[PDB]
Amino acid sequence: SKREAPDYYTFIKQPMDLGTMTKKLKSLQYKSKAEFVYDLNLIWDNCLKYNQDMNHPLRRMANGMRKEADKLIPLIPDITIRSRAEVEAEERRKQINGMALVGEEAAE
């Protein structure tokens, strides 16, 4: 939220976190797997960039989620959404205390 990080849009011109994906689900902004791969890569990069502090448990959590992405990405095929018209035409042409406690538990 702009209130939380007013400089986010000034620093990070590409807001993209789980909230952004959840917003995007019902608006048809997906073509192939590489899109989401880039999304998660930039998510990691932005999380590192905004808080340059290496020792923040937020980046440890980000590393955990990156490992999870590596684990459970293989399922998705690289299928591109081709409109039936395009395929038919081609065929025809062919045819902060809470955060502190969370960090403490992550360390423990």
Phi, psi at 76, each rounded to 5° = -70, 120
CA 55 to chain CA centroid, nearest Å: 22
Q: Which residues lie below 8 Å from residue 62, measured CB to CB, with a gap of 6+? A: 43, 44, 47, 48
Residues 6+ apart with CB under 8 A from 8: 2, 15, 50
CB 46 within 8 A of CB 39: no
Any residues with CB less than 8 A from the CB of 53 and at least 6 apart, and which? 59
In contact, 40 and 66? CB cutoff 8 Å: yes
Contact 49, 12 (CB under 8 A): yes
One-letter amino acid for residue 57 of the chain: P
- Do 77 and 35 meet the contact criterion of CB atoms below 8 Å apart? no
- In Å, how far are 44, 70, 82, 83 from 56, measured between CA atoms? 14, 22, 43, 45
The sign of the dihedral angle between the CA atoms of 76, 80, 85, 91 is negative
Answer yes or no: are the C-beta atoms of 35 and 16 closer than 8 Å: no
How determined?
A: cryo-EM
Listed resolution, Å:
3.2
